[PDB]
Symmetry: C2
Subunit: 327 residues, 2 copies
Amino acid sequence: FSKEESREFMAIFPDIVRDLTDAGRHTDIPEVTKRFAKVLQYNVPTGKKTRGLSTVIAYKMLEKPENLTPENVRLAGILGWCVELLQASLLIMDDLMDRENVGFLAINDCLHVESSLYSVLRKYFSHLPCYVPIIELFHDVNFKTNMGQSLDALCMKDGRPILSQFTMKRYSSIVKYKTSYYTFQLPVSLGMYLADMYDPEQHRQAKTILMEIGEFFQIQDDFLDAFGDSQVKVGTDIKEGKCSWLAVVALQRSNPAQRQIMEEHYGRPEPESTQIIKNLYIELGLPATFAVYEEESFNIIRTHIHQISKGLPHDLFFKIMKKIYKR
Amino acid sequence: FSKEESREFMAIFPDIVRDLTDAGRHTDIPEVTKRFAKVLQYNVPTGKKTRGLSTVIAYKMLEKPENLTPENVRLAGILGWCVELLQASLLIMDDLMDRSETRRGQPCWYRQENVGFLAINDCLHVESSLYSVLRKYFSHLPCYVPIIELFHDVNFKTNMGQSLDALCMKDGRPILSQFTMKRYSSIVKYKTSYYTFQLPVSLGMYLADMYDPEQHRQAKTILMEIGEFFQIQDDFLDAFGDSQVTGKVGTDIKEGKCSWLAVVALQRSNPAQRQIMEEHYGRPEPESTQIIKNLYIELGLPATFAVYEEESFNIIRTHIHQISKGLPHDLFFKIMKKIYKRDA
Ligand SMILES: CC(C)=CCC/C(C)=C/COP(=O)(O)OP(=O)(O)O
Ligand SMILES: CC(C)=CCC/C(C)=C/COP(=O)(O)OP(=O)(O)O
Ligand SMILES: CC(C)=CCC/C(C)=C/COP(=O)(O)OP(=O)(O)O
Ligand SMILES: [Mg+2]
Ligand SMILES: [Mg+2]
Ligand SMILES: [Mn+2]
Ligand SMILES: [Mn+2]
């Protein structure tokens, strides 16, 4: 993203904190509002805000050039921060399920941070025609993300992976509901609504390509968890018994002997068991299978983007595609 | 509540479960929608649904008599179930946070096989679900956005209450310097009074197309006063109630809760009595709970509660008489009549 784009986006964050914790209200509960300021400051604005900045870029590429005022680009930035509040709530839920001090999280902090995005939406968007579509989008994406988290959990029982559950159909459903809706659909649909693009067929056209990009994003992430260079963090998907693309394709390709290695060694704490699974992935040619998928999926997605109709700009989707595939 | 009111309200619940789990959506993930039906069935419909039924009663007393149709009373019932969905989400999370054993005689959801900390996802899922119910039944009505905004605002405020409650503890040990009547009043207001008292009445007002900010303000003032008495009565009965009639053995002392009893005990205590609270309050040993209970008796908290109950009843009744605009006084007298001198 541009130096200008990053600086104007980051400049919004302190306002959102004041809006949620000060707002010149002279609160009767300053101790807990000061704590909530720290929860927001310590968890929301740090590292890459790729979903938030992607909301701004989406809007800038969908809106009429004449309507790209500083005021409208700032509203796009505020929507991006609502996406980052959602992201923060989900990472807090992950931190809590993993497991006072600086960086302490309360169990209800994830519910509280999630709820806060609706206060931001009400403050800035309640008088604009895009308001109800935007709040309904957040409601629907929230519900779908929760269903994705539950589907992922239904691949584990008594701390053991249920390998009978590791199908490509279930995997595709987990990625779609748990990740693709809030990561890929939400930023683009927000940009479209702020640009007063309400046509359901336009949103459906964007959705089809964004779910395809989302699936490759997660498959690449899964591949690199096992086969990536740590010095470019250490992957724990095998140890944690995750429903990974690697595990799903391993089970498709496995003979009975190879399947029994997965049953015995997948989702075990012992480092030796991780190396046994990695050795099986190498034997089954999962790297070559990933290489073929990467090429074939790139070509199909590029084709669908070139074919994008309903008055949608293809360059927006190419920018996203190029970002994920690193063309 | 009438036999009719209870049965018509209960008839709505299975429709809401179908709306959220069997309405032709998410056909690729039936195992999730089937599980979510079980989450709703366990956590939402087995209580007294006092907040849900109170939404219907509020609406019936606020709406113009000639406007009360079976169709509009059903919409009030659906809003009542949305309150019960919010409450279910909050209590799923609170039971995990407090590591509680039971809730309304049922094992806490987080204790059920293969849930534990996944109760966090179920909490967020149940809370998110009420906005899908609002969309289906209210999207075409003027009250739609005010009701959405009220639910999100009450969720935010309830979280401020829960987090303020947590700031009365340091790593599972009560901070007795934090146990002031000011902090107690703030915890009750934010953590329980907004969702329990303000939310049902404000929903009734919005469905009756009552949007006057001053009406909502006057309603809030009296409902926060009633809400404080209700929680003080609840706190008193945790220690001094009969387990067989309350339907629960009280563990507030064991849990180190910022209860009205603990707050008033500290106000009334000499330094020796303060030392007993410092040493024994919030301890797991049954002997420590008995020592605190015995100190509450020594300090005359039963007599103190009886005086508070009579004085606060009189003060709130006076305030309801002074309510202006066109708010029905009878709504607030009906709440008081239900609440005052209760033993459960
Ligand atoms: C709509 C879009 C494009 C959203 C995707 C958000 C996302 C997590 C991308 C990863 O890129 P990154 O630059 O944050 O990560 P890395 O440094 O690993 O490439
Ligand atoms: C606006 C009004 C008057 C709301 C009703 C408040 C109330 C008395 C709740 C009691 O709930 P409960 O202890 O019966 O619990 P539950 O209904 O959850 O079982
Ligand atoms: C944001 C969240 C999760 C809010 C929880 C709200 C609530 C009503 C908790 C119960 O309070 P308690 O723990 O003091 O009482 P009990 O469990 O005894 O009902
Ligand atoms: Mg990963
Ligand atoms: Mg109690
Ligand atoms: Mn509790
Ligand atoms: Mn609690």
